[PDB]
């Protein structure tokens, strides 16, 4: 039976009874940095159980007219346990991820969600002379939401959250070139993505740069008949893999 999985990382375990396959990045599994690719000369820290475990964010509610949500991935885990504590004391860090999006509904519901993972998702602003602010690019483990309409310009340097351009100026149907899965409520219950470390440098500062972005977009809207449960949540659970840190100094933020 291909329908069951079990993922164990640290002191946490994920159990799934109805799933698709597991998507592994670009075919690469996350591993540690080698000696011929390293730059910094001091010894890196490897906590290996206090950081590499499953953290669960807040839950969002899927509605009949909902548009989509997104997260910035080395920013939602910035107050999460000892993963966020090692980010504040160190200057460099590299990390791969295991993302588990989960959403259950009955055989009487329908809908379809696309779960992509976009690297270097640089977004646009509503005022064309400015760039968006940090508070509207990312929340602290809280989803920022796409809109079904076009956002106008103001003094808040907002993101153009028209969902069909995906905040980047592209076609939203062409988002399947990134590592992705679907959650079809007819057949699927969860989605699992394992991402390696993707950058143009072997290590990078984990506060001034978000090199991954998790988008969840309902291509087919949620629908049910009267009598079925109206409240359907979506829960995201992310686990760091092979996280190491370098450049220990006093605590930022």
């Amino acid at each position: 039976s291909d329908r069951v999985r079990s993922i164990t990382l640290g002191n946490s375990t994920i159990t799934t009874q109805e799933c698709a396959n597991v998507v592994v990045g670009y075919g690469v599994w996350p591993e540690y940095l080698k000696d011929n690719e390293a730059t910094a000369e001091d010894q890196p820290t490897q906590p290996d159980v206090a950081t590499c475990r499953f953290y669960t964010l807040e839950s969002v509610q899927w509605m009949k007219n909902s548009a989509g949500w997104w997260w910035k991935l080395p920013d939602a885990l910035s107050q999460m346990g000892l993963f966020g504590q090692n980010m504040q004391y160190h200057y460099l860090g590299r990390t791969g991820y295991t993302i588990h999006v989960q959403c259950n509904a009955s055989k009487f519901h329908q809908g379809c969600l696309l779960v992509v993972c976009v690297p270097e998702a640089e977004m646009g602003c509503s005022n064309l002379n400015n760039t968006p602010e940090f508070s509207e690019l990312s929340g602290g483990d809280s989803a920022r939401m796409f809109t079904d309409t076009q956002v106008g310009e103001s003094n808040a340097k907002k993101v153009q959250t028209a969902v069909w351009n995906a905040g980047m100026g592209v076609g939203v149907g062409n988002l399947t070139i990134f590592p992705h899965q679907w959650i079809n409520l007819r057949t699927n219950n969860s989605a699992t993505l394992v991402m390696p470390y993707i950058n143009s440098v072997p290590m990078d500062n984990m506060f001034r740069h978000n090199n991954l972005t998790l988008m969840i977009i309902p291509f087919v809207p949620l629908n049910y008949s009267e009598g079925s449960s109206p409240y359907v949540p979506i829960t995201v659970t992310i686990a760091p893999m092979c996280a190491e840190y370098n450049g220990l100094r006093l605590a930022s933020n």
Partner: antibody, heavy 119, light 107 residues
């Protein structure tokens, strides 16, 4: 969850500054912004300003100079100030939160504080 | 700036009647529109946002229709809980401008 409420001076003299404080609960000010709307008997509803979730403001063009809104995220309280208080300012003032699923509409309103500017 | 014209000013209907209230803008707001309901001497309540979407606790008798510069609300079957003032507001760009108002009678 539960939502916000406000507190006010009630009634003051003409050409005196006004200070009404909205204290929020159930949500954080780093995720949502606060709008200031004025329900007038002769002029209906009118929008005075907004303090955005990042900390930047936006004011009405008729009331730009006299109006100033600040906030402090740790105390979960919003403070705005309006000056010179003419006779047409007799109305009911509301504080209401926006960013209703990202759609910039007012979600939940305060209880309102009716003011009177006469001697 | 941009002004929202609300029509009509007042209506007189009965329980079980269909009510249509419209709003018109000076220029295109790209369906950045909200609707509010105000009862006797209280705070307004958000009812319909984004020119089609319904609010949290709002029942399915209300309906939002419109695009461009022409928008409309429809109430299918009236109840005793629905009379009062109805406003339309755009949140496209500052300055945000409310509608003039429309009151219901239920004679």
């Amino acid at each position: 969850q539960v939502q916000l409420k406000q507190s006010g001076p009630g009634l003051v003299q003409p050409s005196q500054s006004l200070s009404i404080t909205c204290t929020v609960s159930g949500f954080s000010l780093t995720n949502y912004g606060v709008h200031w709307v004025r329900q007038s008997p002769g002029k209906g509803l009118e929008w005075l300003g907004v303090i955005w979730r990042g900390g930047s403001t936006d004011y009405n063009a008729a009331f730009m100079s006299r109006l100033s809104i600040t906030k402090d995220n740790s105390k979960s309280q919003v403070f705005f100030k309006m000056n010179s208080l003419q006779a047409d300012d007799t109305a009911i003032y509301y504080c209401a939160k926006g960013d209703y699923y990202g759609y910039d509409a007012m979600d939940s309103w305060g209880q309102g504080t009716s003011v009177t500017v006469s001697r | 700036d941009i002004q929202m014209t609300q029509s009509p000013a007042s209506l007189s209907v009965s329980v079980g009647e269909t009510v249509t209230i419209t709003c018109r803008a000076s220029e295109n707001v790209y369906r950045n529109l909200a609707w509010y309901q105000q009862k006797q001497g209280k705070s307004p309540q958000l009812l319909v946002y984004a020119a089609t979407n319904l609010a949290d606790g709002v029942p399915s008798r209300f309906s939002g229709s419109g695009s461009g510069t022409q928008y409309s609300l429809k109430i299918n079957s009236l109840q005793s809980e629905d009379f009062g003032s109805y406003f339309c507001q755009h949140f496209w760009s500052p300055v945000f401008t409310f509608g003039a108002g429309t009151k219901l009678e239920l004679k």
